[PDB]
Design a protein around this ligand. Structure first.
Ligand SMILES: Cc1cc2nc3c(=O)[nH]c(=O)nc-3n(C[C@H](O)[C@H](O)[C@H](O)COP(=O)(O)OP(=O)(O)OC[C@H]3O[C@@H](n4cnc5c(N)ncnc54)[C@H](O)[C@@H]3O)c2cc1C
Ligand SMILES: Cc1cc2nc3c(=O)[nH]c(=O)nc-3n(C[C@H](O)[C@H](O)[C@H](O)COP(=O)(O)OP(=O)(O)OC[C@H]3O[C@@H](n4cnc5c(N)ncnc54)[C@H](O)[C@@H]3O)c2cc1C
Ligand SMILES: CCC/C=C/C/C=C/CCCCCCCC(=O)O[C@H](COC(=O)CCCCCCCCCCCCCC)COP(=O)(O)OCCN
Ligand SMILES: CCC/C=C/C/C=C/CCCCCCCC(=O)O[C@H](COC(=O)CCCCCCCCCCCCCC)COP(=O)(O)OCCN
Ligand SMILES: CNCCCC(=O)c1ccc(O)nc1
Ligand SMILES: CNCCCC(=O)c1ccc(O)nc1
Ligand SMILES: CN1CCC[C@@H]1c1ccc(O)nc1
Ligand SMILES: CN1CCC[C@@H]1c1ccc(O)nc1
Lengths: 425, 425
């Protein structure tokens, strides 16, 4: 038997398992798949042989993300500034300006006012309490309705909705305004910070840190899918798809929220939690790497396209590049290459699409989702609860972070909490 | 005897006297000087013969200033867009950008935050109540201290303080933060609107409207300085520097606040009012028209100069122009032409100063001040009261407007109030 079993080998699981190990505990980490790192997934390009790409999480900001910064410093892991953008090719209408902040002067007053309104709303949110414990229900409404109340003129209206489509992985009519405001809160109550936190990448890929962390973890089982967690006895029993059970005093669930519904918990999880767990969150984020010819370097495009954002990712050669597009998988089918060409040519009519690369996170049974975003009405019913212990079973992950949800920093933050909870026992 | 005597023939007095006349009242207007229009003063340039200039109030915005808009439409008075600015020559340090909004991206987050803080503060202010009736005392502190609390980085810090020096006619250490916030409130709670309301000028000068209004006023006495207002009897008696007294049921004081202290009121004015009336406000605004050679058209400069602002005013010829500078008369001596040259050359080292033109509003015994600005601590003690009736004696003027203080619109607004008060009697 173990002091602790950690279920799931993303950053959250890895941290928990390492930190518990180093505290002198006997830890087992069970990972269902063939790799560690979870939604942090560097690998070779499908389009360009020998090219290493990030197919999930990539970007960080040392100052919004201090735990991650610490990890990077700990292992001497190199980061670099993302390629700064020099060419702006927006589709925000004829009054827009082609720079990084594309709002014209004629909109300045409206933006000023909307800025005050948004930040005043975000300031209603205390990040410690949970979104369900703060009388925030009036904000838990479709983002398109919230934004209609702001009565923004067209460039700023469309610019705000494009980055919110990007950031949430949801179209405006499925996104919750409260959740948008939560992201604002999470970035020291800054609308601007939401985009500015896309500051740096791993020079050598996220696997750098994955590998550094795992090397400190003594017991790991890959291809071990947990199907059962049973704390009806004195010691927790963890059953597994094709193997013998494992036992521990404590279990950490460090798997994605939208997979919890596939595990049988005994006893059943607290009732307040059950519906949302069954529903899942509504995150439909879709990140497409696009291999292209004819693109100048340093392009950034924001607009009203089916790709709200399209921007430079990496130089492939003197004529070729990868770009990255964000949309959502409800709205867009990345396997329809004619659709990809149309969405790119909308911004960049001179560019030829050579291929795309993505991961279908939503179809992956180890995930059933990209990053977290609630359906309208979910997180004002239940939110903080989702990341609280049920007896000896802890829940961690980016998905349940109050502080940094949907970011790597959130995976680290939740793990930190569970480790400490456990070490006091 | 009259139904009403109006004392002072600026826009406030003119409106009151006209509107009362048209209501069927018997009105006398007494003006102490040789002209009508008061701090709206078009005249021929001291520097350039045949050139008509505005030596006080000039700028308006039809949408912030609806009464003024109505007056212009009433008499068919033509306005034009002020010369839009195309050349920016700021002194805001090396990270500043030479455009109308000079804040660099590196400051964007700080500006966002400060914007929220300022507007949240301005929103404490209800424009109807008076600055003394709202528990705003914590804001009634030197602007430099308030701004130090914002902890702004240099370009935005200096940009904000430059326009506030301009707008208030006071250096940061004599200006009240509460008053700055009042100007913000007055512009539909917009920091930006404070500057954007410099939208248009009178095509033919402010005298256009002065003359249109006065033509509707049947009894006017120029060179008639009021020295006494006595409402101890049943009918008000108004005594005058060199002449027989005049009598009326009602008197409107439409003279500048800083001149009230020279009139003997009988009985004495309500005690709450007396100290501030004796002090006067601390407005030291100073507007200098500068005749120059070598200046390109469309210049605008904001910076940390003894002139916080310096901008284009009018084309004099192909080589010559007028610019306008704002500073304050405590800080700067406009009769020291070597000082003027230094202050211009700081922004514009290629420009030759040929002459300056201004009016010493502060030395003018008919004014004793430019536009209103309170000393720190004044208007949180007494403010609304200054513009309230004392028995049969009304107080109007830009100086006492809650809605639009220091603007022409405020002169119209206060007059409107007094007229209506009187017509209900
Ligand atoms: C397209 C995309 C782009 C992103 N971009 C960024 C970004 O730029 N910056 C950033 O900070 N974040 C980014 N992220 C979000 C961030 O990457 C994730 O929220 C974070 O990595 C999640 O870490 P975690 O440990 O909570 O979960 P995961 O990384 O999901 O780890 C969960 C582990 O559980 C395993 N598992 C599932 N079921 C079982 C089972 N029953 N038994 C055993 N194991 C199981 C899975 O294999 C997985 O390894 C992105 C995510 C996606 C999808
Ligand atoms: C340099 C400067 C620039 C300005 N720029 C602008 C601008 O761009 N836009 C804007 O809207 N406003 C501007 N103004 C502010 C605005 O012009 C004034 O607040 C406004 O015109 C005041 O009108 P009023 O009727 O209250 O008083 P005033 O115009 O001051 O009229 C007061 C009248 O009382 C007379 N008087 C004084 N004592 C007596 C006495 N005892 N008896 C009889 N008469 C007396 C004076 O002669 C005067 O005619 C500016 C002002 C100045 C000084
Ligand atoms: C009583 C003190 C008052 C202090 C006043 C300070 C603010 C005065 C600003 C006056 C300048 C406004 C010009 C608008 C921009 C413009 O015309 O120039 C535009 C560029 O302008 C912009 O960048 C617009 C974005 C601004 C968003 C508004 C954010 C609120 C910030 C409030 C600022 C606070 C200042 C420091 C704390 C150029 O062309 P374009 O149109 O094709 O692109
Ligand atoms: C969850 C949804 C999130 C929505 C995010 C929308 C905002 C994302 C903005 C990302 C762009 C930031 C770039 C900063 C500007 C830059 O680098 O480009 C600068 C020009 O930038 C500026 O104009 C700075 C002024 C901005 C003042 C901030 C005002 C607050 C407004 C909040 C905006 C709200 C949007 C619509 C409601 C170019 O060089 P320079 O530096 O030498 O000059
Ligand atoms: C460099 N930090 C964000 C700058 C502003 C911006 O618009 C942006 C968007 C995406 C990205 O990768 N980098 C920058
Ligand atoms: C044109 N309206 C204000 C534009 C912005 C500005 O900085 C400004 C300042 C003075 C002035 O006369 N006009 C404009
Ligand atoms: C997918 N989200 C989750 C955290 C940050 C990441 C992301 C990365 C790039 C981008 O353009 N938009 C969002
Ligand atoms: C003197 N203030 C009083 C109202 C507006 C006026 C003014 C005019 C021009 C300028 O640059 N600053 C202030």
């Amino acid at each position: 038997m173990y002091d602790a079993i950690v279920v799931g080998g993303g950053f959250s699981g890895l941290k928990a398992a390492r930190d518990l190990t180093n505290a002198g505990k006997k830890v087992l980490l069970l990972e269902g798949g063939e790799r560690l790192g979870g939604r942090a997934y560097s690998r070779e390009s499908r389009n360009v042989p020998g090219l290493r790409v990030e197919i999930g999480g990539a970007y960080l900001h040392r100052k919004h993300h201090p735990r991650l910064a610490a990890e990077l410093d700990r292992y001497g892991i190199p980061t670099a500034a993302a390629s700064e953008f020099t060419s702006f090719r927006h589709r925000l209408g004829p009054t827009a300006v082609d720079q990084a902040f594309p709002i014209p002067g004629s909109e300045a007053v409206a933006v000023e006012a909307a800025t005050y309104t948004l930040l005043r709303d975000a300031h209603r949110i205390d990040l410690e309490k949970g979104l369900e414990n703060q009388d925030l229900e009036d904000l838990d409404i479709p983002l398109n309705e919230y934004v209609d109340k702001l009565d923004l003129p067209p460039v700023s209206r469309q610019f705000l909705l494009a980055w919110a489509w990007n950031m949430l992985g949801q179209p405006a009519d499925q996104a919750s305004a409260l959740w948008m405001l939560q992201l604002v809160a999470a970035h020291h109550y800054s609308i601007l910070g939401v985009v500015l936190s896309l500051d740096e990448v791993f020079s050598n890929g996220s696997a750098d840190l994955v590998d550094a962390m795992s090397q400190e973890i003594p017991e790991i089982r890959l291809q071990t899918v947990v199907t059962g967690i049973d704390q009806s006895g004195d010691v927790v029993n963890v059953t597994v798809k094709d193997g013998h059970a494992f036992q521990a005093h404590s279990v950490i669930v460090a798997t994605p929220m939208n997979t919890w519904r596939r595990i049988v918990f005994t006893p059943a999880l607290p009732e307040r939690r059950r519906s949302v767990i069954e529903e899942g969150h509504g995150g439909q984020g879709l990140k497409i790497l696009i291999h292209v010819r004819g693109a100048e370097a340093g392009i950034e495009c924001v607009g009203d396209g089916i790709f709200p954002t399209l921007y430079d990712y990496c130089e492939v050669s003197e004529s070729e590049r990868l770009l990255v597009a964000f949309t959502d998988s409800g709205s867009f089918d990345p396997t329809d290459i004619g659709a990809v060409k149309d969405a790119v040519l909308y911004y960049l009519p001179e560019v030829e699409v050579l291929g795309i690369d993505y991961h279908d996170w939503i179809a992956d049974p180890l995930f059933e989702g990209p990053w977290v975003a609630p359906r309208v009405g979910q997180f004002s019913r239940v939110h903080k609860e989702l990341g609280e212990p049920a007896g000896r079973i802890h829940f961690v992950g980016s998905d349940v972070s109050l502080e940094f949800p949907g970011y790597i920093e959130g995976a680290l933050e939740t793990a930190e909490c569970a480790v400490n909870a456990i070490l006091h026992s």
